[PDB]
Design a protein around this ligand. Structure first.
Ligand SMILES: [Zn+2]
Lengths: 507, 351, 85, 351
DNA sequence: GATCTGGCCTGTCTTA
DNA sequence: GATCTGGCCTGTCTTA
């Protein structure tokens, strides 16, 4: 109990310069109730939510103070002289926030709280160096397996329904405030014996599309304006596919809201929503214009599942299928995927059944179902196209691991879209799933910009959710008051490197 | 003096703990809703129709020349009555944005056109405020006054977030009563005058204001410093003269102790205070009647409609006044699975 | 009992036959000691008094025919109270 | 030749993989309900009607005279047609009850009264059997023969549980082909004679029997010992002469390889054989027409209905014949969430 | 025209 | 009579 006092936040001393805005200077603060001073008067908007959060900065300096070991061994490996050139660091932090349903409430005392729980976390992707000047920025430490639940650092733990915005922004407000206040100031830590300075670059990449949309003020999730990154409408992204240019970014969305509200040109609702390209709400958080890998995979997988379902019977031959046949087609498709490929039907489709489904030999068991020969060849060819473009955004860093697929991705997508609007048009005339568009349009651009994608995936969040369930049973207190406190703490302890180092046992 | 139980029919996910009911030119419209507006009705304002127990909510569409509004939580509504040149006005300021913030911008909301079949287009108009602007706030009250014979407006009370210098991410969500200065806002132009009060040594909130004939009565409200709910009612009297809008005030000995009260107009100026919370736990059941005359405020209790055991035991309740001595109340509900409707409703009427 | 239900030597009608065999329509595959279960007894009576409480909040025996709405309402005030105290 | 899809409407939870359709006096009755009879219909038998694609099951009600029957799964059904004394009978023996045991008791099922309104009461008369009782078995078949002019029945084939010596709670649930001895059962009295023949080396299972004019043809069944599906067609000729039912037999050149076949009578004695399976893995799609005459049985394949890809790819399938060249087939279905209804249906018809 | 039966649809109960 | 607009249902889509 007194052994981990170090590993938790609110231990190691640190300071910012210039001093942070609107944040206290006390560095000893540990787990804080995230309500953060709600007066909880009956007369006001009630406080229905329990939460716990580290003060963001403290969680950071503890994470990094825990990476002290690996950045010193890294520095030594580089043979970059450790004592000199210590002030020019650059820290790139991936943060992610995702919700979770069906968490049963506790009888407890109070207050009343909804079932759903939201887990706000982050992970340190890399830490690099620049000075004296000259060369670039220089990597030192880079997380080798970001997707692992081993490194995801929980920060804010809440019981909140994703749907209510009021409360979500009420609790996550302070956290965002320390972030945008923090981007300006550089950190000072005492590490390796010496006082050194860090710059932080925050990329929230891990959010699912519905959350990105809802914090950015967009209309979710099936609205005429599909691309979070582009201004394209539904039908406009129907005719043209492979050619698009990323526009949507934070400041632009803010200014676009101020237009939507203030409304100087006095257009009617329809036309106004046309002018701002569908920003109906003031976003609060800033989010990198990037694409989640996981949901992308699941989206395309379910679209191909649907295409399969339609090819089993003949849809383009008779355009208006009965409902009974709709189920009959599902029944024989899942029959097949059981007898071959060893797969069983799902309600919501997990990404694992997406990895079994996406393979070519999986498309083989279905190719046998469709009577037509050229159709049989068409969807097969489609799937091989998809296998060729998938590792680009799935793999961590395609610039090395899979170069040729990357360079050919634009052309390959062109080919793909052509084949769709060619034989499948009936199902893509005026409608395209958000992800098929996103994956056929903005991928080469973002891979060119971030350098890589899928390393930034929601997976490194999400997975962590598993823990949150077991840590809510095994390691819980258990009563409503203390429970989030000790889950959060124990989670933090699970994530720390210092311990995992020990548990490697050095070969 | 009675209550009919109301069904929320479809779509009861809109109503939220604080909200507002705008009664202008017949039908009353609901204002404010959970989260950000949804495409179904992007405006954020619904017309409300109550027929055969059914509570039905309809989409309202703004005029092209009008600004669009965020679903404010607990703003200060001032209903400005018909006169030159443009009836009927609703002054809304400034509430709390669903994205959690305080809006300091004042809006003038009104009626535009109809029907052709039963459709009322509306127009919202921002007003630039030349100031000496009011600090952004919620729970405050605003009221329309006429003196000799020009018209201005009086703004006071409510809370605001901790001063931006002293607000720490731990104490962020903490909130303090804004300083006791009254803001006299001319409708046009945007001149906003801030005025100190020797008689008021403290600020307050959720104080229901009743304004008649160049005089404004502030019924008791929750004060956050001493956590007391003063029985004392506070009257003020505004002097508008060229070119100085000088302001006097006075304390009234005894009045009702209430917070978050619903004032439902009945007679000409006679509103019944429908109740609210008397203390930090117990909620006022007693339904009270209020006339306002030049002599003074005339206050008589009235026999409250008998409450169903549910609303009698309800932890909290809220609502709005549909006017014409008719008002709405809402009771939060539990069960499992979700009802879905988080709020049962009742409609109360007088006589 | 089952053998009577099947053979049915008295050529008796179904409605009344069921009375004679007193509820046995099938051949039992296992012997269980004629004994009560504690747990589901506790849950059965618990949920019963939950029901009686619920009907008792509003006045059921004065007006015998409640609707869906007053019932759901009764449940709401009940659960709200049980939580509150 | 045609097939069309059937919606099972309400209550499609009654059909289990083996079951039996009893075609007598027009309307056909489903039999072999899943599990034990539920007092929705305590009887256990269902009138089945197929209208405009809808498959509806009605609850039959036994006469007071009747014994009640357990939902046997795979019994030997022998239709005995109309003549003196009391037409027309369906001989069911013995199948296996929803608990695991084999009845080994013959039941005679007959029609009784109608309607009043579209109602059919039935009566089951169990008959005692002295012998030389038939060993408890299932999957066996039974047939009706008439020799000058006495009517008797022929009972042969089928699996049974391992005898109570080899019987072991590890091997308890194993089955084995019961020995090849034909049982001649007089309808009344209950004398059951057991004969064997050198021509019959082994016992079979699910071998579809056709019976006409004192001659019985067993199609190739499934032999469990050598695991063959004999293409040898079996014939036997019985004649009852006082006081012994003398019996003979012959093997045939060519016979079908199929197990669990569905025989739908169309012509006088001409049947359409659908077949359930060619082999262990792969089911038979081919439809065949089988007529029979005094000279012999003559086989002609007719073009099978074009199968929907589902039933062509379905691992298992079954059904029954509604008679009059009309039959029902059933396809198990995997879907999630549960359909719930487990079986799609198709109605098939000839010419 | 009007029974009877079965029907569905409702509609409550009891165990789970 | 017969528009309008909304209203609900339905209808598929589209996200989680
Ligand atoms: Zn785009």
């Amino acid at each position: 109990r007194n052994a981990e006092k170090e590993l938790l936040p609110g231990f190691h001393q640190f300071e910012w310069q210039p001093a942070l805005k609107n944040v206290s200077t006390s560095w000893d603060v540990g787990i804080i109730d995230g309500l953060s001073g709600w007066t909880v008067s009956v007369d006001d908007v009630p406080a229905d939510t329990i939460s716990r959060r580290f003060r963001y900065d403290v969680a950071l300096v503890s994470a990094l103070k825990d990476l002290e070991e690996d950045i010193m061994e890294g520095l030594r490996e580089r043979a970059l002289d450790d004592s000199m050139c210590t002030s020019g660091f650059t820290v790139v932090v991936k943060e992610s926030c995702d919700g979770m349903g069906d968490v049963s409430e506790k009888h407890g005392s109070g207050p009343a709280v909804p079932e759903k729980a939201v887990r706000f976390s982050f992970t340190i992707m890399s830490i690099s160096i620049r000075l004296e000047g000259e060369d670039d920025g220089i990597t030192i430490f880079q997380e080798q397996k970001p997707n692992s639940e081993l490194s995801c650092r929980p920060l804010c733990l809440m019981f909140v329904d994703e749907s209510d915005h009021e409360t979500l922004t009420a609790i996550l407000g302070p956290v965002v405030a320390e972030r945008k206040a923090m981007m300006e100031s550089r950190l000072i830590i005492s590490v390796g014996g010496l006082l050194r300075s860090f710059r932080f670059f925050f990329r929230g990449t891990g959010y699912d599309e519905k959350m990105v949309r809802e914090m950015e003020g967009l209309e979710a999730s099936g609205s005429t304006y599909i691309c979070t990154l582009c201004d394209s409408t539904r039908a406009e992204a129907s005719q043209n596919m492979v050619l698009h240019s990323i526009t949507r970014s934070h400041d632009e969305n803010l200014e676009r809201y101020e237009i939507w509200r203030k409304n100087p040109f006095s257009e009617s609702a329809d036309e106004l929503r046309d002018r701002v390209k569908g920003v109906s709400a003031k976003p609060f958080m800033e989010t990198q214009p990037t694409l989640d890998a996981l949901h992308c995979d699941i989206g395309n997988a379910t679209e191909f599942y649907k295409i399969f379902q339609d090819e089993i019977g003949e849809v383009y031959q008779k355009p208006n299928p009965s409902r009974e046949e709709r189920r009959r087609w599902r029944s024989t498709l899942d029959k097949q995927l059981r007898k071959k490929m060893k797969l069983k039907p799902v309600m919501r489709m997990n990404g694992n059944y997406a990895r079994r489904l996406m393979t070519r030999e999986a498309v083989e068991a279905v190719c046998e179902l469709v009577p037509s020969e050229e159709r049989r060849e068409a969807l097969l060819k489609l799937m091989d196209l998809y296998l060729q473009m998938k590792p680009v955004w799935r793999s961590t860093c395609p610039s090395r691991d899979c170069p040729d697929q990357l360079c050919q991705y634009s052309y390959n997508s062109q080919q793909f879209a052509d084949l769709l609007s060619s034989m499948f048009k009936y199902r893509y005339d005026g409608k395209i799933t958000n992800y098929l568009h996103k994956t056929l349009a903005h991928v080469p651009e973002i891979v060119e910009r971030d350098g890589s994608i899928g390393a930034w995936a929601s997976e490194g969040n999400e997975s962590g959710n598993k823990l949150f369930r077991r840590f809510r049973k095994m390691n819980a207190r258990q009563s409503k008051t203390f429970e989030l406190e000790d889950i959060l703490k124990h989670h933090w302890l699970y994530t720390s490197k210092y311990l995992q180092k020990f548990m490697e046992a050095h070969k | 003096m009675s209550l009919q139980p109301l069904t929320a029919v479809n779509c009861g996910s809109l109503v939220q703990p604080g909200f507002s009911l705008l009664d202008l030119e017949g039908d009353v419209y609901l204002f404010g809703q959970k989260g950000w507006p949804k495409r179904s009705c992007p405006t954020g304002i619904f017309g409300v129709r109550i027929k055969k127990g059914e509570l039905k909510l309809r989409a309202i569409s703004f005029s092209n020349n009008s600004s669009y509004l965020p679903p404010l939580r607990c703003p200060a509504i001032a209903h400005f009555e018909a006169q030159d040149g443009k009836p009927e006005c609703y002054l809304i300021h400034g509430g709390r944005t669903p994205n959690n913030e305080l809006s300091s911008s004042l809006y003038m909301l009104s009626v535009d056109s109809r029907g052709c079949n039963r459709k009322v287009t509306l127009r919202c108009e921002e007003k630039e405020l030349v100031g000496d602007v009011p600090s952004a706030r919620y729970g405050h009250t605003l009221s329309v006054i006429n003196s000799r014979g020009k018209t201005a407006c009086v703004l006071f009370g409510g809370r605001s977030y901790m001063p931006p210098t002293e607000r720490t991410t731990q104490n962020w969500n903490s909130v303090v009563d804004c300083p006791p200065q009254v803001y006299l806002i001319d409708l046009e132009f945007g001149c906003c005058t801030a005025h100190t009060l020797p008689e008021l040594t403290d600020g307050q909130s959720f104080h229901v204001a009743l304004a008649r004939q160049d005089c404004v009565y502030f019924l008791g409200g929750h004060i956050l410093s001493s956590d007391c709910r003063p029985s004392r009612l506070i009257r003020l009297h505004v002097e508008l003269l060229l070119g100085s809008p000088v302001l006097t005030c006075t304390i009234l000995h005894e009045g009702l102790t209430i917070t978050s009260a619903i004032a439902s107009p009945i007679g000409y100026h006679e509103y019944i205070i429908f109740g609210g919370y008397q203390s930090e736990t117990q909620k006022r059941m007693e339904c009270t009647y209020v006339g306002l005359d030049d002599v003074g405020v005339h206050m008589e209790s009235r026999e409250p409609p008998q409450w169903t055991s549910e609303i009698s035991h309800s932890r909290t309740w809220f609502g709005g006044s549909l006017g014409k001595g008719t008002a709405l109340v809402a009771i939060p509900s539990e069960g499992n699975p979700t009802p879905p409707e988080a709020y049962h409703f009742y409609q109360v009427s007088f006589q």
